[PDB]
């Protein structure tokens, strides 16, 4: 279930581990672009 347009939900995340390489690379994703960062960092 997703936040709707005009009912957004921006979750703050900290002091943890995440794999942005997987988040980026998986074939299930339709599109991806970064702004000053790279998913290969994590």
Partner 1 sequence: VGGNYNYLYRLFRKSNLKPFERDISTEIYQAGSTPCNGVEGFNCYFPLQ
29 to 6, 7, 12, 16, 36: CA distances (angstroms): 23, 23, 22, 23, 20
Nearer to partner 1 by Cβ, of 8 and 29: the residue is: 29
**Minimum Å distance from CB 35 to partner 1?**
16
Per-residue interface string for the shown chain with partner 1, residues 1-40, x marking contact by CB under 8 A:
-----------------------xx-x-xxxx--------
Are the C-beta atoms of residues 42 and 21 closer than 8 Å to each other? yes
Nearer to partner 1 by Cβ, of 3 and 21: the residue is: 21
């Amino acid at each position: 279930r997703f936040a709707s347009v005009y009912a957004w939900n921006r979750k703050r995340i900290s002091n943890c581990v995440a794999d942005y390489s997987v988040l980026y690379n998986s074939a299930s994703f339709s599109t991806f672009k970064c702004y000053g960062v790279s998913p290969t960092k994590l």
